[PDB]
């Protein structure tokens, strides 16, 4: 299966606009996080499926725990949410050498404000001005009128919990 295009891509998508690649009809990192929900990872190699979906994005180190069923936080509630009955695997590895600039890497953003939480596998790419007060904003950012997206601004000297991490989520359909 063409997994090389997903893992070895030059640039990953922002978590708010996470990318999904459908893979069907087909057949390693130094230190990484690899776990599966609903099935053992030794048994995934012996299980036939019709389609496998690969979701890829970039988040902080300390946010990787949110990529799991039944979690909360800015990523799980406003960016990428998994259903409680999630059956798949989660892969995440350190990408500090690729997605960190001394002056700040502004390729990756996350949704910091939203009126409600995301449903599972819901994507929201809108950029409407978020109204935090009682007065309308009319599309003008200002006091109590926030732009809903925020940059990570990855720097190479940040701590391990603040370094950028590339995440791949594998869902299975059969």
């Amino acid at each position: 299966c063409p997994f090389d295009e997903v893992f070895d891509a030059t640039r990953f998508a922002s978590v708010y606009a996470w990318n999904r690649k459908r893979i069907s009809n087909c057949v390693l990192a130094p230190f990484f996080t690899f776990k599966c929900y609903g099935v053992s990872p030794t048994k995934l190699n012996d299980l036939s499926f019709t389609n496998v979906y690969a979701d890829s994005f970039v988040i902080r180190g300390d946010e990787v725990r949110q990529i799991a069923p039944g979690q909360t936080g800015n990523i799980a509630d406003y960016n990428y949410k998994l259903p409680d009955d999630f059956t798949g695997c989660v892969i995440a590895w350190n990408s500090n050498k690729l997605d960190s600039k001394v002056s700040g890497n502004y390729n990756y953003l996350y949704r910091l404000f939203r009126k409600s939480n995301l449903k599972p596998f819901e994507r929201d790419i809108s950029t409407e001005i978020y109204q935090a007060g009682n007065k309308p904003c009319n599309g003008v950012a200002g006091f109590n009128c926030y732009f809903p997206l925020q940059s990570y601004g990855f720097r190479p000297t940040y701590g391990v919990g603040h370094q950028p991490y590339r995440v791949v989520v594998l869902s299975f359909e059969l």
Epitope: K35, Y37, S40, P41, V64, R65, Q66, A68, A92
Partner: nanobody, 127 residues
Framework: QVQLVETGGDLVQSGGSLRLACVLS????????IGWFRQAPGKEREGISY????????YYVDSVKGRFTVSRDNAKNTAYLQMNSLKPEDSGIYYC????????????????????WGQGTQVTVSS
């Protein structure tokens, strides 16, 4: 919800033993994978041992292989970590973690993937 409490740490001499306990509360021990971590001063929280749920395999790092052992007590809903022939290099704060996920053999040593954590217990081994 899920709650972890690690106890058992104490001041012990070199070559001694110590048994650490991690009591799960709110959920069933058999439905969660347990991982033990330690944090040396100035260093990050590093994994030591892994106990997969549903009678899954157990994995240990090379530094504690043969000297550390993990067990489970479903009656007491408690996971244990038996530490024998300790060395001063084993000192630090020891945490347990819980996760309903089946981990890979080389993908559990990182603490970033575990959602549920305890609060730690100090283990001091004098030279």
């Amino acid at each position: 919800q899920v709650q972890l409490v690690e106890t058992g740490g104490d001041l012990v001499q070199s070559g001694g033993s110590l048994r650490l306990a991690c009591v799960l509360s709110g959920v069933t021990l058999d439905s969660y994978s347990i991982g033990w971590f330690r944090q040396a001063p100035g260093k990050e929280r590093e994994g030591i041992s892994y106990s997969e749920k549903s009678s899954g395999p157990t994995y240990y790092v090379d530094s504690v292989k043969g000297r550390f052992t993990v067990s489970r007590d479903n009656a007491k809903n408690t996971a244990y970590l038996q530490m024998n022939s300790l060395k001063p290099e084993d000192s630090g704060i020891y945490y347990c973690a819980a996760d309903e996920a089946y981990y890979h053999e080389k993908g559990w040593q990182s603490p970033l993937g575990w959602p549920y954590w305890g609060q730690g217990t100090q283990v001091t081994v004098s030279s």
